[PDB]
Design a protein around this ligand. Structure first.
Ligand SMILES: [Zn+2]
Ligand SMILES: [Zn+2]
Ligand SMILES: [Zn+2]
Length: 178
C-alpha cells in the first residue's frame, strides 16, 4: 500500500485498501472508512467494479438525463467519488469549510455552500436526485465568482470548478462533444 493518504497526500493514521494500493485517512475517504469489513475495498475499487459489471455504462450519456437520475446506491456512490475527486485537489481547501463574507464593494451570496456541507448532505441522504448534488457543487463556485468579482482570487473557483466538471464528465460517462 501507499504510505500517504490518496486525497490529502499526508501521512498519519491510514486505512489501507485490500484490492488496490491506495490508503486513506478515516474522514478523507468518502464515505468515511468503515469500522469493520475485512477485506475493505475503497471507492476507487468500488467504482471500477460498477464499470466492469456493466461495460455499457461507459457509453455516452446526456447530462440532462444524468441529472434526473434518482439517488439509488450506484448514483450515491458516483456522487461520493466525484466529491472525493474535488477534495483530492489541494485548492479544495478554499471551499471546504463554511465561508464568511465581508469585502468592501461585495455582498455575500444568498445561499452559501461549501464542500463539507455537501459531504454532510450526502452522508445524511438529503439528495434525491443527482441534480441536487450537482446544483450545490456548482453553487460553491458560482458564489465564489460572484463575490470576488475582479479580484484575481476568483480564478481559484474557475480552477476547482474545472476539476469538478472534468470528473463529472468522466464518472458519469457524459457523451464527448466539441
Ligand atoms: Zn487524508
Ligand atoms: Zn482500492
Ligand atoms: Zn450488464
Amino acid at each position: 500500500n501507499s504510505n500517504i493518504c490518496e486525497v490529502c497526500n499526508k501521512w498519519g493514521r491510514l486505512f489501507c485498501c485490500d484490492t488496490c494500493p491506495r490508503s486513506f485517512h478515516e474522514h478523507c475517504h468518502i464515505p468515511s472508512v468503515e469500522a469493520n469489513k475485512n477485506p475493505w475495498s475503497c471507492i476507487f475499487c468500488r467504482i471500477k467494479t460498477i464499470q466492469e459489471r456493466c461495460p455499457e455504462s461507459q457509453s455516452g450519456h446526456q447530462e440532462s438525463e444524468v441529472l434526473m437520475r434518482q439517488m439509488l446506491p450506484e448514483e450515491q456512490l458516483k456522487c461520493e467519488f466525484l466529491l472525493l475527486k474535488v477534495y483530492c485537489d489541494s485548492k479544495s481547501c478554499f471551499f471546504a469549510s463554511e465561508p464568511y463574507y465581508n469585502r468592501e464593494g461585495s455582498q455575500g451570496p444568498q445561499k452559501p455552500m461549501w464542500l463539507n456541507k455537501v459531504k454532510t448532505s450526502l452522508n445524511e441522504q438529503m439528495y434525491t436526485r443527482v441534480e441536487g448534488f450537482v446544483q450545490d457543487m456548482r453553487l460553491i463556485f458560482h458564489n465564489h465568482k460572484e463575490f470576488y468579482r475582479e479580484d484575481k482570487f476568483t480564478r481559484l473557483g474557475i480552477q476547482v470548478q474545472d476539476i469538478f466538471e472534468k470528473n463529472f464528465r468522466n464518472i458519469f460517462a457524459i457523451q464527448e462533444t466539441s
